[PDB]
Design a protein around this ligand. Sequence first.
Ligand SMILES: O=P(O)(O)OC[C@H]1O[C@@H](O)[C@H](O)[C@@H](O)[C@H]1O
Lengths: 474, 474
Amino acid sequence: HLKPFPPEFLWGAASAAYQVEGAWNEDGKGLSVWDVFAKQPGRTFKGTNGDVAVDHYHRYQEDVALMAEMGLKAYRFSVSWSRVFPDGNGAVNEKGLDFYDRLIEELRNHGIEPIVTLYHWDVPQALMDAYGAWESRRIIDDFDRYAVTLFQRFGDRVKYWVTLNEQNIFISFGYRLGLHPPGVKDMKRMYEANHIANLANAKVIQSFRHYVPDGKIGPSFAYSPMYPYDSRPENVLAFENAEEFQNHWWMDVYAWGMYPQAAWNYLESQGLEPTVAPGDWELLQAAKPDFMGVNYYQTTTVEHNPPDGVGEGVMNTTGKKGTSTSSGIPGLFKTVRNPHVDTTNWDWAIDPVGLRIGLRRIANRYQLPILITENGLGEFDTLEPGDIVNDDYRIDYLRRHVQEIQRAITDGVDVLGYCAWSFTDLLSALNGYQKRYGFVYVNRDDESEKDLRRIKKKSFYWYQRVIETNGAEL
Amino acid sequence: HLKPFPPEFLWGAASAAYQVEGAWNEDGKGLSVWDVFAKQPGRTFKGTNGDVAVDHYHRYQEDVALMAEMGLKAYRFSVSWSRVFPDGNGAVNEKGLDFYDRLIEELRNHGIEPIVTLYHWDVPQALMDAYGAWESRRIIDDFDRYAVTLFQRFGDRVKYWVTLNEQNIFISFGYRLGLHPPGVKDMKRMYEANHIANLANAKVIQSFRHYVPDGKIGPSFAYSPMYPYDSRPENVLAFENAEEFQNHWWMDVYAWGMYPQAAWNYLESQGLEPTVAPGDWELLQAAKPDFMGVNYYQTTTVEHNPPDGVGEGVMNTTGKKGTSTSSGIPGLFKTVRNPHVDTTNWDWAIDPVGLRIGLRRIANRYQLPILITENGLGEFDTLEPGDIVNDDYRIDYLRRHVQEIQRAITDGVDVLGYCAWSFTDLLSALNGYQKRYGFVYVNRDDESEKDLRRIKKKSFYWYQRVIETNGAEL
Ligand SMILES: O=P(O)(O)OC[C@H]1O[C@@H](O)[C@H](O)[C@@H](O)[C@H]1O
C-alpha cells in the first residue's frame, strides 16, 4: 500500500541560465566566467557556447505557455548574476532584474510556482578578474549583496529558493579537474575555494531568514550515492571513504556545519585542508536549510584502490558508449562499472533504486526534507517527419525514478517535489546540444541554430498525465 | 605513517558476573533470572549454569594477581544486581556491596583501572515476578536506585562506567528468539521492553551526571556492521535496511535520543512500535554519553529478501563449522555467508577490517569516542604437557584486530581503550565452557568440574608484551 504523493507535491522541471537563455550581451548583461571560458578553443564540445543557447531570453513567453499546457506545478530556473550586476558588485542593471520579473509574472499568471536558483556556475567575469571569484573571501559579501537584491525584489512572489547548484561540481571541476572556469588543477586551491563557497552559502541562508521569513531555502547537491563493489572488507572500506569524501564532505557541512573527521585528517595529512578563520564554524553551524536539494542522475560503485593506483580517468563527453574509465583517489577508492545496471550512451548508470537509496540515506543521516531539484535522461533524440519525437527511453527512465520516489515517501522520506531536467532541450556545458534532456525538443544542433522551434516530445504528454493524476498513473 | 596508541590507552580485559563469579547463593545473594532460567532443561548447553562458573567470587585475589602479572591497564567487570539488592528493590545487601569493594580495592592496589558494567543480563527474578522486569516502567526507578547505590559507594574510585551491556542482545534474545530470560517469542513485547530499557539507560546517565560529575559513562552495544553482498541496487537497499534495523535502531537512540524513521514506520505498519508516554523523547534526548561502548566480534553480509522469504535461521551453539543458516526479515534483508572472509568453528566471521569499518561508522555518524568493551576469539583449547596452551589462533585474531584499531586511530577515530574478552575462561550460557575466550585457561570442561586451576595461555604472554610496548609490538 504505497502512500500517495502529497497534495501540494511540487511537480516541476528545471533549467539554468547559461544553458538556456542566450542574449549573452543584451540589455546590459556583463560577461560571466562561462561566456569567456567557452570561447577558449578546446574547452567545450565542438566549441558550443551559450551566446544563443535555445534563446529562452527572447522566447520565454512561448516556453511558459508550453509549461502551462503541460500543467507544470513548479518551474526551477537560475538567475544570471551578470544580468543583475554586470561587473559583479557595482550598480544594479535594472533591465536584468526586469527580465526575471517578467518571467516570474508569466509563471504566476499561469499558476506555476517559481523555484529560483541563485547560482548556477556563472559568476561574473569581473569578480574573477578582481580577486579570483570563489577563491577569495570577498565573494561572501558580494554573493550576499546579489542574493539580498533578489530576495527583496522577488521574495513576495517566490517561496522556494536554491542557493548553490552543485557546489561539488563547479568547485571540483573548476579547481581540481580544470574542466570548468577558472580551469585550475590544484587540490589545495580546490578545498580553499570550497570552504569559501560553504561560508557564502551559510551567509545567504542567514540573510534569507531576515528578508524572506516565510520562504524555504536549501543548496542543491550533485548526489551520486556510493556502493561497494562487493562484501570484501577492503571494498566496503573503500565505500566508506568514497561516501564520506564525495558526499558527506558537502552534505555534512550543509546540514551540520561540520566537515567529516576522517576526510579532514586525510587532507590535513596532505597539507590540503582549508584555512579556517575565527567565526567560520559559528557561521556554518547557524545556517540550517529548510531542505536538502538533490540533483540525482546515477549511483557510483567503488572498490579498493592501492596507494599507487588510479587517479583521474577518462570522461565521456561525446556520447560514444563505453569510453569512460575508472577514476579515484590513490589509497582510498576508485570507481568500477556496476555490472548490475545499464548505462546511457554517456556511460551514466541507470539506477532508479539508487534514488530511493539516496533519499533514504539523507533522511536517515540528516532528518531533512528533500527537494529533488534535478533528475532526467540525457540521450540522442530523432526528429521524425511531422515533428514527432518518440523518446520512450526517456519516459522509461523518468517513470522508474518517479516510482522509486513514491517508495521512499512510503518509507517516510519527506520529499517536497520533483524537478525533471530539463523542460526544453538546452546546452550541456561540456557535451553540446545533442545530449538532450527536454520534454520539449528544440530544433537546433551543434552546427546550426536553425529556427529553434519548440516540438513537444512523447515524454511531454507522459509527464502531463503524471501531473494530472498527481503521480497515481505512471 | 600509523599513529601510536595514545599514552593512556586502556589496555583491558573483561568478564561478566554470572559468567564468572559463582557463589550464586552466598552472602545473601538473590536469585537472578539467569539462576532460574539456566536450571530449566534445554535452555543452556549441556545444562551448564553459573552455580560455580569459574568461582571468581572466591578466587578474585588470584585472578587480579594474574592481571597484575600481565600488566592490565583496565579490567571491565559487571556488578551482580541480585548481590546488591537480592529483591531488586528493597533492602541493600552490604555483603554484596562489600565484595565489589574488595574487588575494586584489589584492582586499585595493583594500578588497574576498574570499568564497572552496571547490567549484564541478570535482573533479579523478584522483579520478573513482581512486574515482568524490563516490560514495566517500574524497572526504570528500580534500576536507577541500584545504579545510584553503586555511584555513591564507588564513584570516588571508578572513572569508567558502562550502563547496559548488549541491550540489543538480551532484549532480542529474551523477547524475540526466546533464548534468554524470559524466553519470549513476541516482537511486540520485545520493542516495548526495548523502549523501557532505553528509558532506563537515559535515567541512569542523568543520575550519573549528578553523582559522578567527573566520570565517563556509556552503553555498550553489540555491533555487527552490515555489508551489502554486492552492488546490485536491491542488495545495497537491503544493507540500508539491515544497518538501520539492526544497528541504528539502538545507537541512534543512545547518541541522538531518536529512533530512525524508516524502521519506525515499518514497525508501526506492523503494529509493533513501542508505547510512547509524555516526556520519553525529552529524557532520551537529554542523556548524551561520553562514549559509545562497542562489543565487536564479526560483520554481517546481507542481500535482498522477498516478502515471502527467510525469517529466523539456525544458530551454532555446537562448535561444528557450517551448522548456522541464514536469517532475516521478509521484505527487508536476509543474511548470507561472506565469501571473502574466514570464519570460526561457531560460524562467526573473522573480519578485522570490519572493526575499523565499524569504528569509522560510529565516528562518522555520531562523532563519539569509542570504548571497545569486548573483542575476542572463542575457540577450543588443548592443555598440553607442561602447562602449555598454544592458542596461536587466538593471538592471530587479537593481533589483526588490534592492528586495525591502530589504523582507525590513525584515521581520526578516538578509541579510548580495548577490553579483550575474556581475561579467564568463563561460562558461555548458550555455548558452555569449551568455547574458551580467556588469556588464562581454567581447568574444567562441560562434564568434569575438576579443580578450576588457572593456567596462563600463550596469548597471555603475547598481550603482556602488547601492553608493555603500548601496542608498538604486535
Ligand atoms: O549537462 P550534463 O553534464 O549532461 O548534466 C545535466 C544537467 O545536470 C547537472 O549536471 C547540472 O546541474 C546541469 O548544469 C546540467 O549539467
